[PDB]
Amino acid sequence: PQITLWKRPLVTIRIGGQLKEALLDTGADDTVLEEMNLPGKWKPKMIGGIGGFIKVRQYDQIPIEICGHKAIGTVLVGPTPVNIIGRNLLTQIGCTLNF
């Protein structure tokens, strides 16, 4: 599909038994999701943006479905105000910028 940018490019994502709305975010290197208690190993990390840094937990090889497209990769979990689908997963679902 083609998504115009008049409004925020929010799409439905699925991670486990949780459906969430997330931003398709070409400015984000990484995928950052709102606080959630995922199983398995993780590592602490800091990530920086407008306003400064937040602390997140890095989980690896997490399957995530984005508009019915399968992805699997690193997901950062922490107190983000918005769920963010970054370039690590945008590539896996075939997402490009066009103009």
User: Which residues does the annotation mark as catalytic?
Assistant: 25
In the complex with ligand MZ4, which residue's Cβ is closer, 14 or 87?
87
Q: Restricting to residues 14-73, name those near ligand MZ4 by CB under 6 A.
A: 25, 27-30, 32, 47-50
With CB under 5 to 8 Å by kind, the binding choice for 2 among its own copies, ligand MZ4, none is its own copies
* Given 12, 19, 29, 60, the residue binding its own copies (CB under 8 A): 29
DSSP-derived secondary structure for 21-72: EEEE-TT-SS-EE-S---SS--EEEEEEETTEEEEEEEEEEEEEEETTEEEE
Distance spanning both ends of the chain, measured CA to CA: 15
